[PDB]
Amino acid sequence: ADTIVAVELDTYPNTDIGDPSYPHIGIDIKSVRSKKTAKWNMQNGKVGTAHIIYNSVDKRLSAVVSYPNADSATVSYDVDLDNVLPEWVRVGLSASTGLYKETNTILSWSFTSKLKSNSTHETNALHFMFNQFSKDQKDLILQGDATTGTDGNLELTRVSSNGSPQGSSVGRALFYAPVHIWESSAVVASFEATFTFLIKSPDSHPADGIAFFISNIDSSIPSGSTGRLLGLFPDAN
Amino acid sequence: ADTIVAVELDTYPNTDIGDPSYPHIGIDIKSVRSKKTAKWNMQNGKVGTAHIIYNSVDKRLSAVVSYPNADSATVSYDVDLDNVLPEWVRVGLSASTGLYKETNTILSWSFTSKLKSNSTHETNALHFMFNQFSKDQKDLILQGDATTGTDGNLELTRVSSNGSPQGSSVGRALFYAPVHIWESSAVVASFEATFTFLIKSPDSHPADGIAFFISNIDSSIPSGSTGRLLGLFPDAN
Amino acid sequence: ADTIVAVELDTYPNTDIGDPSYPHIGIDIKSVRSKKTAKWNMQNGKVGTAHIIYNSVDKRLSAVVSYPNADSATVSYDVDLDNVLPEWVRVGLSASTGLYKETNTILSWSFTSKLKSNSTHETNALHFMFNQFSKDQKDLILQGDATTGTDGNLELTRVSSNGSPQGSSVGRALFYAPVHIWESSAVVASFEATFTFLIKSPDSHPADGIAFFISNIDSSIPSGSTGRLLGLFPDAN
């Protein structure tokens, strides 16, 4: 299977698999059962912002999710990515729905990664910023039900003609170029990601969530990973 | 077949195909016969720097090549890239040798492209910086004789284990991710590229040169494009 | 006597001193009488964007002003800044009103300057971005009627608590740190500036305009430089 490290914006509580009894943000390391979570007050129909950061000095993965004029939610977890992910990876966004649904619209997404060599202290870096998505975005790899173009946004999951989100949907978008996330021969390594989203649902219980993830370069949506699996894992192990 | 826009650092004069009688830098628009050139005092064995810039406001492609403590060579050409290249392209470096040779070593390469929407005025951007190249640089597509790893450098053309250049060689390196170079519905579009090189040759007359180029995404080294064709064109038309 | 280089967004035509008979954007080099102008379709009440760029390779100062979903206006002028401005300067925004008025509200302002050494080929750079202004913005030098705080915006000229513009007003805002705009020992040098503005007026003829300028570090609003002088020049010579 693929190797996944992700930050999830979980909108639906699946208490039988470790989720707390309320929407939450979490840090997932090779498992959908978050290693750490924090309560999240998701606002249906409002544009939110998620910021993820990691640096090899502290080797701590943190994330903060918030809405304009509102208290934010934050979660952090100490993890050595050199022992979890392959040297080269691809980064992306994923989302899913199951019995319950919601729109999983991405309005913007930026990412920056830097690697400083230990031998010459020279830096290698990558940065990309999307504030508008095109109908034919060649620098993005769309998987599953993900689509771009409508209103210049990226719709990770299926949305019908009348604008209603569909259930049992899963979709992801990965940046085309592989990213050198870590190198034993580097003095300092770090990355940051930011994305704005719009989660809207008709029912009282929206599902299932959105996640920023990092994985092996040839990663694909695990078959049947709709619902609680967030298009990231093959099972709930 | 391929669509090419490039800035050439032509070290060998091929006066039979439009080249001036001296090393020069030039702007090539869909043809190896530069639309504009400038005399270049290449210094065999010294590390040089090349800077290329373009913006849709002025629709002018300019380049400056220089060596520390020496007069620089500059060349500019008016050109609307919207009417020359396809919307999406790939950027890279190319180099070749023929009867005569030279090392076509790249010590660093950076690139930045920005596109501003005409509707929301928001910007999309891409930036990458290579100050060290590794044996397995996954975010680079290597073609022909290009290799990476030795001394953390990118050798565009064939060189022995000691550093001796070989003739009849051609190689290119392209950034993995496609770049959205121009968009009709964009207020301003621009890009810049910078690369440091080391051209060293044992013979009196080195050849054939190095070039920074922009092409269709599926661009490949044209058959037989060694020597004077710099691995960019199929013929000298 | 200050040394001024500026890009003006001239809303009121003063034909007695060289202005064309319509709103326009122009490049002013040590004189309010623009060296080059372009027709500008100012839209009263709407937020617009102005982008200014200059690079030592081409030695050309260009600017583009536009409003979402509308054609833009562009003006360019070839000028060697090392022969016009002192090596060190301060950058800022200025605006004024006279018999007629308008709000000269700045919603955001960014600037980036780079100087690359000719001996070591290394670069010095400065970048600042203001997407929100505070009541006490310590990194900004406010002159005349300029104030910060109201709705997180920078009001260059006097406005009432409700938003009504006042006549006979002049104000400027300069970045606190001096900028090394040019250095003889530099291979390449360049800068870019961007700002969003909101010009609204109750009368049929708004005045007088907004300008992005570069001046000697100790520059101040010339005595009586309200109205047509845009707070930049002592007279209309």
Added chain:
Amino acid sequence: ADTIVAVELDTYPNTDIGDPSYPHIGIDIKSVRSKKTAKWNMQNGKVGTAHIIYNSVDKRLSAVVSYPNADSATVSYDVDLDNVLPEWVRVGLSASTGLYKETNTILSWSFTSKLKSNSTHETNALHFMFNQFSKDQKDLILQGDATTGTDGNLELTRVSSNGSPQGSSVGRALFYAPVHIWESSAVVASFEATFTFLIKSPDSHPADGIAFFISNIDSSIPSGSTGRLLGLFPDAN
């Protein structure tokens, strides 16, 4: 007195005031007696690099110092800068010598600070990079014995005409523009600083060290702060 937050590269152990019995790097919060330290293998005559980082999500100040092809030293400390420093500050570098001496040469220095609004989620930023220091660097405030120009470097402490470092010297360099380090109404605040240095001494025990610091905007060298006080504190409390 001033309010100081700093990262010290302490080359001389003063065990009577809390220093460990070996050169070290430390985090100083309003006191020369570091809140946290780490063993540092300083290499006399070699160019080293220091990287400092801080972010409001983890509220952790970290620093890493190293030399090419050698293990690095790292120190991290939990601290909420919002409760230690004033809203606006100035950043700089300081160094000193006492009975024993060393050259406290700075070859490069960069800094970046970002503040994201909680009501608009828009960010304000500042970035500066010095790879070359000029004899008259107007964007730098030099204090005490600090000088610039010699070989394009910044000499924090006095060096004789023969190139020998002098004892009982103290000097600092602060960036001209004040920096908005924290803002209650900001969702995320962060900053990073990097600088290369060259510490050389004929002595068997060089002294006293270099430090990157953040202080009140009107900060000046405390009288008599040579030696173990690193030009940052008035006493060793």
